[PDB]
Design a protein around this ligand. Structure first.
Ligand code: MG
Ligand code: MG
Ligand code: MG
Ligand code: MG
Lengths: 361, 367, 361, 367
């Protein structure tokens, strides 16, 4: 008999700290007849990073609202089935909805998400830096910085059509890393296979390379020809892409991002599959405020230590904060998810602005 | 030199001829017409009309949101450079093929008018080939569907798409054997299952039946359909699981099918549909080329691609406007004349909607 | 109603600048009833390089002429279908015909080929040198030269039955290349797999190796055993060979040459396929005058920058020029295709000689 | 020591017995006879006769152009060293197998005469084995083809090649079941489709029919035929897609077929045909060995290879000269005597054309 009673949609205009200069984030409030309210966030990283954009996100909540009204939000797999029937794909639309129902379930259950996701403890999860693309000594300065801030894993954005510079970047960074630190070379689909093969086979570094090419097939091809661990990310849209990645032997790890795979319920199924096949995983969201970071972090904290790599906190990159003082935050390069029932963050609607849409029955 | 100058968006509420009931009255289609103007006064039109919002990853409100996201980026582009415009849309909004298809269709219109050639010719066709049209035969008993087909046949249809599916093998079996046995001579049927089978039910029914007609998309995924294909004897047609060119390449390398349907709104437009068409010809696929839904505008776009396809590879097209109660573009576009439809031969697309017939625009974008 | 009205065949005797000492080129003029004339060129690189030769080329135009007369040249796929029905294979015969119809279509459309082939602009395409086979310091002198001329990519012809010399060649050239320049080792089918494996696994260079062996199967075998990017060329005769190359995971790039694949319509289908699977490509013709170079260059200029490598200009190697002042030419290591409608080159028949054959209806 | 001294080219205009009409009257064959002389007065002859110019990558004018290109390079060669001559032709003009086949055939003639042995013996055969010949049964109704076969049978044919194909499954089905059911006892048929099916139509027809006779080349490519083969129950014979030895190796490794036809003009001559023949024996293929077209000269060359093939692997040969209206070499070569033909036992090829019967030479090449 618990029923979803109202969905309210907020649009947050979030300038980035280091300027696209802004993010378009959607906050979603879900009410129930018994007065338990859940919240979710979907904030695509602009509209060019993934099949996702803020105005489409809000349009998708509109298409789904009338099918979500009156569902029992405690039945998470059922909620997801209904979302899949009513609007295929659009994982970016589905994530904040699924996030908010999880929040409800955790509040009704009296348990934080990390415990519903199976974890023994609110594990402090190591956080990782983003090193933006530049020259060999530039990136190396940005790393010295991040290390001073307490990051011990760093994700260097590299890529291009120019084999020589990526070679230079990789060999400088891989050698001039502080002792005990970890670096991932994030190419974000910017190589063709020819470049990946030339670059990686010219370099002694055997660090992680993340998503070197645009497709799974192109990544698998690179993997058979080079010696580095390959991490997949943006080409994984649904569970079947992960199964294909596994069956092609394409990778040794994946990133799992709720807004890319359709929320916590889908992410958890992927996470369990990754543990079963020995993958190591970065579990984080695509972008947004500490609300999105918190949901991801509950899933990251509940992952076996052998399989869990550092998480990125998207809110580190924002000029503003709509939910100051809430969520997993960086404390000496570690973020601990909250232990209160549900998500553990409650946005104040006054901080958010006036709702851009609202659906009742 | 030529430059996109304005994009105008129209939302058309299209009633269906035959509502059907759902477990919801599915009543009407939400169609988007897009008008692209340029600085030299050549204007192109395109349509994107998802079959409601549950058929594919596509819905009307999402389509109009996508155009909003892309508009700032299309303003200023030379619409004659089609591949380039496609790359921009791909850089600026990955996926969302249902968003991209009307934009690409309008650029093709513009290109055709600048070239003074009909789309079927730019697509390589020797002539405005009349293309056979198929019937839609709704699910029911063996005796019903067979009566719905005699009826179809009296209207000039020689190819028929029989909608079967559901989790009771026994009546799917009865339907297939009945329909396949009692077709008029020279007629053809395809059994459209529409992802309704699990692989277990597919294997049980197809291996229970003597009929060797096409089975279209028995299961939800490519991987499931390829599994069924290795275990049954019928020609397999893929459709809904094919979202982009790499899925076609994957279908081909697994030997999953002997044909595909190509629908611009599913694959992102004519430029992308054409590359797939040509791939199909290279590997010997037979293909239905048609759109997902909409008025005779989306249907004419698809029919240009269908008419330019070599006869060996070309099967019947479905005309979505045949299922509509209204017509916003009366007397324009390829229409069914006794089981065949012929694309226009005017430069470009060959249809020009009257803004007066469309309602007030819901969005406009200019530089 | 536009109809092909006459085909005229010219035979050009072209001495090479650096001496087989000559090329046999065929120029083809196609007239229509509405007075729009298109031109094409097929010029095999002698008769030993590919399944192609000048006298066969002219013989094939003879077999096809009566099937081409009266076709609508604007319908390019239809023209190609008719050529395939009437004379299977013989891509070398078909290329100049298809080239001339494209020229017509571009003139009727009022658009240059690079825009009909989808490009945003007449992109200046980087040109690459040909370094003929010799000793390590010889080839290195020839490269210093080409670099002075403005070439920044160089194609070194290597190959033989002698592993030690190719090792010497490769390691000298790969190390003594000017900064920022690119080198491809063009073996032109001159290795068996045993030699390819010994050579490439003895060398630190990870430059492109082009067509190391006689067949696709032999190249794929080498590719699985070595660390360099493999570029395919001469074994690709038709689209199905490219599909097989892709499915075998044999290569990371291909060269596309109109006279080898049957013209611009076939080349474009290959080019689009290469972009879709992440290949990088050299798009150029097999040999001939700036007319053949120009057609290829329209297709090269319209290829996404991520996928496009340098083009070779065959006319650089000729003593003569029948079309002086026309076509894409080298200007500081870059060639820009023309922007006039169609091909953008108009041969003067007076410069060509007396037609060796002519077909009317 | 022995040296090629002159090459002489003849062009023979061969009328067919049965013109057939095209959508063009296909009237006559363009055949090339080549004479190779040497310094010791041993002369060899070869023939290359494509089945018109649309059947394979081959045509008469191209063949005479190819000989022109190769002549300077063959002049001076020792024609006894066959592999070597093949390598030279391969270095000097890649591909163009239709060009190389008559040159290689003439060298084999020369080699046989120098050795004082018939080709069938140099090819390893124990004796001049009479080889069964098959009929050609033209496309028509079930009742026609079956009447064309009783007729064939009365002429001594026990193997019949029934030409089917076209994009209407229903009558291909009727033809196959009719013909396969009503063969004389002891007789055999092959259904020659000649690349006319797409894979969808192949799968529909073959999986609709009880007949398990050979199907020859259902589809255009090896990859399409191998796809069909995995899904149907009939023995598959490959032919036209096999251009060179690597395609045979590819056919073998995909399990695409249980037999092949070997035609010298398609694969480049006897030297290349022989290597493929032997490969077929090693892997247990059954094979038809015959030429593409031409006079009893090309037919005798192929029949030497056919007679030397072990009986387990050897099926019927087609004799191209049976379809000609003329005969430039009357009373020479292997001819059909009541369903069998026997290659000659004279040294070399065993046929010697009279230049007087051939017209004036169209080209001559000497050192
Ligand atoms: Mg990434
Ligand atoms: Mg379907
Ligand atoms: Mg090469
Ligand atoms: Mg055959």
């Amino acid at each position: 008999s618990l029923r979803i009673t109202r969905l309210t949609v907020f649009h947050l205009d979030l300038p980035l700290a280091k300027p696209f200069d802004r993010l378009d984030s959607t906050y979603l409030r879900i009410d129930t007849d018994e007065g338990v309210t859940g919240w979710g966030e979907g904030c695509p990283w602009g509209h060019s990073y993934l099949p996702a954009h803020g105005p489409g996100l809000r349009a998708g909540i509109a298409t789904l609202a009338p099918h979500l009204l009156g569902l029992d939000p405690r039945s998470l797999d059922h909620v997801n089935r209904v979302m899949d029937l009513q609007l295929p794909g659009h994982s970016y639309v589905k994530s904040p909805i699924d996030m908010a129902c999880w929040d409800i379930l955790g509040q009704v259950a009296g348990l934080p998400l990390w415990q519903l996701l199976g974890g023994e403890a609110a594990t402090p999860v190591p956080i990782n830096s983003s090193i933006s693309t530049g020259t060999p000594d530039q990136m190396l300065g940005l790393i010295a910085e991040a290390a001073a801030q307490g990051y011990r894993t760093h994700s260097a954005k590299i890529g291009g059509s120019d084999p020589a510079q990526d070679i230079a970047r990789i060999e400088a960074i891989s050698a001039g890393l502080p002792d005990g630190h970890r670096v991932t070379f994030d190419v974000n689909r910017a190589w063709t296979p020819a470049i990946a093969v030339e670059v990686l086979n010219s370099v002694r570094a055997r660090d992680w390379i993340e998503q070197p090419c645009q497709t799974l097939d192109q990544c698998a091809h690179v993997a058979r020809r080079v010696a580095n661990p390959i991490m997949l990310d943006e080409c994984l849209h649904e569970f079947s892409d992960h199964l294909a990645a596994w069956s092609r032997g394409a990778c040794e790890g994946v990133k799992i991002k709720p807004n890319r795979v359709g929320g916590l319920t889908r992410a958890r199924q992927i996470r369990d599959f990754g543990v079963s096949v020995g993958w190591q995983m970065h579990i984080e969201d695509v972008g947004g405020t500490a609300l999105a970071d918190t949901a991801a972090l509950h899933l990251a904290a509940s992952t076996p230590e052998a399989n869990r790599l550092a998480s990125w906190l998207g809110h580190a990159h924002l000029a503003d904060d709509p939910i100051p003082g809430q969520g997993a935050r960086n404390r000496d390069g570690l973020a601990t998810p909250p232990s209160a029932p549900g998500l553990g963050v409650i946005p104040d609607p006054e901080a958010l602005g006036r709702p851009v849409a609202s659906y009742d029955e």
